[PDB]
Symmetry: C2
């Protein structure tokens, strides 16, 4: 075949039969027991797997039992490791491990640690740059005619993973607490809501469950990834993240934001990654519906499982689909009212993307560390694809010329808000620029518990700072664009500061919204504020404007006036969407100086929780009863209500349905579980009805062995 | 709930704008100005197309280039009163226009046309008519726009209706100081934009062969197909103004990854349900075919992908050119070393040597600034449509800045390490010792980036550009470039120790004469003993039948011989290859490969050498008789004699020549041994000046046979 002598070796699952043709091997010993030296030492004891699983660049023991005692005078043998169907030591897919005298760091090698009557005991070491996969094992003997080799033995298959504990691996993490959280933790917390009202929920990463590590390799084989490249964090995150969004029957998850979900599970229903990854595997087709946090849970499960240090990040007021622009347009009418005809781009209340830890030998020194990777597509230089890995360190500084779509993530976090008046004659004029709305807060789960951490300054400097000025001018050099110069600037306000605030309602109630105007000038003004409240999706996309209102105001010199609006539940309850988000605008005009003041804020309606209840003996192998309790808060009969139950260690994900629930009644879910893991665990629940959804529940169960 | 407005991806899609959009409560008619007719001086003889360098497209609509003024005249229902009247022109593209993304552009009539902005100056008004000078922004989007004239009433807008006749194409403009794709001089512009014909350099370094290819960017329907292609790639219209993204997304469309791409790459030797990549005379042929079938065109290899991608780039206006690299390390995975294994006896280990260096491999170079990288990296950008494992998987590479490659700055984007490795690798000779041990004997750092050549600005000669991609052999700048690469990703697995041989200065080297197809020829190895010493050797000669990519099919001749060199001796050995050893086993491009390895017994140093030969295949004869006058008839005679001593079945002859003939093909059932078939044809030339006719032949057996003829078709 003209193209190449050997077809690509891109499937781990594919294999060939290595030919078996004085000193024979009777038995080989791997200390694969989960309580054993190997797995414990390697931090691979957590996986629900019955094969040896080691971490590259570190020693482990094996013991060959030959037919007669090996003696270093007439005997020569070596352990062989092979992956894929076309192995070449030239390509790294065929590793001959030689019995070395000592173990040279960074290089494969065997060492006879001990020998006694037909059994040499070895301490094999692997290179820190080894291909990550499931390797086949063989013992080969080089006789004076040919080579005698072992037969195919499934039970000796070895999984070699990324090793963050090894100082020579790219994936190296210098802190146990971090390696604990960032790799070992299989339960995580995703944050949502909005800046002023952060909401929490739990996600089960389930990286150690039965089947997961094998589907992660399956995903890669589906990606048809070159075996030689699976030991490279970069290419691994770069290829994996591209498989998350089912690009038409290809990827893992079909992404959807239509509040219907005509044929799958509602994105909000999902309890964790396990649920999905195993359905993907079985169906072999894309699992239906996910959104920014779902794509991010499954992906984080993919990194952690393989050994790459990862954590999900949440950005508040996120400028997605930016196309590298650092400017978001809000269109205003001549009189000051918001213009909905064209003001078509939204800032997402919040947006979730992952962060993987690794080195960047492809860029200069210093850009190593955490790499932001977003598997939620957007238009970059190649089309509509996931973005990154981008060096978080480059972003913070403006070096957007460094690869893996860095400009499109810089924008997500650094866009300006421009309020432009569109005059009735086809003219345009800019009035105000808000340089402090986008990327107002970036947060992630704390290393200790389920608390939050402000990794905000890891992405940007504080506003006003010179370093900030600098990071901006730098991005501007490498392609980031600001198509509209502020030209002049913004409205001097005539020393008039205005700003509002929304009270934090509870689903179905009413809430105030005060508005404060502070005049600083020794001047009397005449304002005319307007209020526009809409029903939006969490992405900022408006469905309907439930309330509009206008105020006529007289501002006294050095005066401070405040006025209250009352938003009646009757105004919103009918149009509400999936996560109960409401967006407000408050554009105002100061008649004297025709100055435009403008403000935005979001609110999310507090929805009640599910109550999880456990009654019993919290001992591994012991039945323990859990109860899923939900009272339909809606003063309406909820239809086709589903409840999901998950909890890595304690339960396989389960889902119960109910044809309907009478307005204000309570349903109970009874289930007995046999926990296989001990230590602090966690039960997790979700609710999904034809109506209400994004109702979550979680219990901090404690288990002993 | 994902986005307020769906993606404006198509250029073929279109929204319907209202002829009258009024709004306003109650408080002659509605007799205001009204447009009676519109005049775009779109004729080919006219000013517009000529001054815009768009007069060559066989296209009846107005084609124009961004950042430069063009003239239009609007005919109203009555005089333009600079008081009561108010109006402006509009360009809109796709189903979802937004002023924000440049998909709806309202051209304000301006007093004076400022640079970089859209504007229309009223240059002159005769009775009821107004003449405008409209200027596009240098950063405009490329594609087919829709024109509308709009009149502002105090209550809304009165506007024209969908008039397909006025649709205007806006292309890139290498003639514009501000267009990101600007070229300083005409010699280059005429060559890299306007020249619709090129030559692909192939063969082997010591036998550089040539063939013409019709880019045909100006034939009927190509422009539209180019646009159709970005549509099939769902390319956001706001991106089609970026020369980077167009070539980035455009190159990825060439190689058909099933159902998608433009061409199905194939290197087997059959080509079952398609046209052999060696038969293609040009892109025209293929693009229209793509378009009509809406499915991948079957079979293309590296020169074809580049011939098509090149037609595409030039058609839209991005300066581009095909480039052939001699001895290429494709599929390099950013490793700067290729490995050849030798058996203990010094002979080549065919079981373990699985990699290959292509005799040649052609990519494309595209010209544009690079606003995403530090200053100094603009200019020619390397782009290769022939896929190879890179950061993302098995995709094309580029645009990779040729300037970054040359100085080793491979950290700058668009798959740099990989094109760098394509031209900078070292061959490493390793004795795979029977015990399982390997030992690095030899290292030839001068085989791979040997000669990167391109067609010349003047005529059809070659132009050596090797010095653009790499510095001089073993010179400090090249030592630094190379060292910078290794710092940003490129790697060297094996180390060559401080040294790893001296070969006792017993040099070795050989030369192969090139026979014509089916003739005997000689190969000649020589030996130098540069020492006041005497040695003993054993040389090994391996002659293989390979594909143009380096992959072997068979060994038709192995030879071993003992040379005894006296001190300061220079013996010479000659081998005679009879045609009979290779004839009934040759693949498409008649490529033969040679390995020559020796063992210096005493001072057991290994010497290895490899070269490649292409057997010369005779031309096809084209003679025209008639008139070199456009519109007027002219006769074209294609003559081809079967050189082989065997009958050729299903012989496909091809004819092509942009501006002279529509690509054609005539099949012959058979050509008896040493027979001569002829193909007569009449063409009515439609372009003037220098032209070229191109022939191609492909049969069941013989294939990869070409020809041409330079005609001068005047008025």
């Amino acid at each position: 075949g003209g193209r190449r002598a050997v077809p690509p070796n891109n499937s781990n699952a594919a294999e060939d039969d290595l030919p078996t043709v004085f000193l024979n091997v009777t038995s080989v010993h791997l200390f694969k027991e989960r309580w054993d030296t190997n797995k414990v030492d390697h931090h691979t004891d957590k996986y629900e797997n019955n094969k040896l699983i080691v971490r590259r660049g570190q020693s482990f023991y094996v013991q060959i039992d030959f037919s007669r005692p090996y003696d270093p005078r007439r005997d020569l043998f070596r352990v062989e490791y092979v992956i894929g169907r076309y192995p070449q030591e030239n390509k790294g897919t065929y590793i001959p491990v030689p019995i070395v005298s000592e173990l040279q760091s960074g290089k494969w090698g065997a060492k006879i640690v001990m020998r006694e009557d037909r059994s040499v005991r070895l301490s094999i070491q692997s290179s820190p740059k080894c291909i990550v996969g499931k390797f086949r094992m063989y013992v080969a003997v080089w006789t004076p005619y040919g080579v005698l080799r072992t037969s195919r033995n499934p039970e000796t298959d070895t999984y070699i993973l990324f090793n963050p504990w090894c100082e020579d691996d790219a994936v190296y993490l210098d802190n146990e607490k971090e390696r604990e959280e960032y790799v070992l933790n299989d339960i995580g917390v995703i944050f949502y809501g909005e800046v002023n009202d952060i909401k929490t929920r739990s996600w089960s990463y389930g990286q150690f469950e039965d089947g997961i590590l094998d589907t992660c390799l399956y995903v890669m084989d589906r990606a048809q990834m070159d075996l030689s490249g699976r030991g490279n964090p970069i290419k691994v995150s770069r290829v994996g993240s591209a498989m998350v969004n089912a690009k038409d029957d290809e990827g893992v998850l079909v992404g959807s934001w239509d509040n219907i979900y005509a044929y799958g599970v509602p994105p909000s229903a999902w309890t964790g990654s396990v649920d999905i990854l195993l359905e993907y595997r079985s169906s072999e087709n894309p699992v239906r519906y996910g959104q920014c946090w779902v794509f991010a849970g499954v992906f984080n499960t993919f990194l952690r499982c393989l050994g790459i240090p990862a954590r999900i990040v949440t950005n508040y007021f996120s400028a997605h689909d930016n196309d590298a622009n650092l400017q978001m347009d809000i269109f205003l009418e001549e009189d000051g009212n918001v213009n909905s005809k064209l003001t078509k781009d939204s800032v997402w209340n919040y947006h979730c993307w992952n962060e993987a830890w690794m080195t960047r030998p492809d860029l200069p020194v210093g850009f190593g560390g955490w790499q932001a990777v977003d598997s939620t597509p957007q238009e970059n230089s190649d089309g509509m694809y996931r973005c990154g890995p981008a060096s978080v360190q480059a972003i913070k500084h403006g070096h957007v010329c460094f690869q893996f779509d860095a400009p499109f993530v810089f924008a997500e976090v650094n866009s300006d808000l421009i309020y432009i008046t569109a005059k009735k004659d086809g003219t345009h004029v800019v009035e105000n620029v808000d340089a402090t709305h986008i990327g107002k807060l970036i947060v992630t789960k704390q290393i200790g518990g389920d608390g939050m951490m402000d990794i905000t300054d890891t992405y940007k400097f504080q506003e006003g700072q010179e370093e900030e000025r600098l990071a901006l001018e730098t991005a501007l050099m490498y392609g980031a664009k600001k198509p509209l110069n502020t030209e002049g600037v913004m409205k001097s306000r005539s020393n008039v500061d205005m700003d509002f605030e929304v009270e934090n309602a509870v689903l179905g109630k009413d809430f105030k919204l005060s508005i404060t105007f502070r005049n600083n000038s020794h001047n009397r003004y005449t304002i005319t504020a307007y209020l526009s409240a809409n029903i939006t999706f969490y992405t900022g996309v408006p469905k309907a404007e439930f309330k509009k209102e206008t105020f006529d105001v007289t501002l006294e010199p050095l005066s401070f006036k405040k006025e209250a609006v009352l938003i009646q539940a009757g105004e919103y309850m009918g149009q509400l969407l999936e996560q109960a988000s409401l967006h407000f605008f408050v554009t105002a005009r100061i008649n004297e100086t025709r100055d435009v003041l403008a403000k935005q804020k979001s609110t999310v309606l507090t929805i009640p929780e599910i109550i999880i209840k456990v009654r019993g003996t919290q001992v591994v192998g012991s039945d323990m009863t859990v109860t899923i309790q939900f009272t339909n808060p809606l003063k309406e009969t909820l239809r086709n209500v589903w409840v999901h139950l998950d909890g890595p260690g304690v339960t396989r994900p389960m889902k119960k349905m109910f044809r309907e629930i009478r307005p204000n009644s309570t349903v109970q879910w009874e289930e007995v579980c046999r926990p296989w893991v001990s230590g602090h665990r966690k039960l997790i629940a979700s609710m999904s009805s034809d109506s209400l959804r994004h109702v979550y529940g979680e219990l901090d169960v404690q288990i002993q062995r």
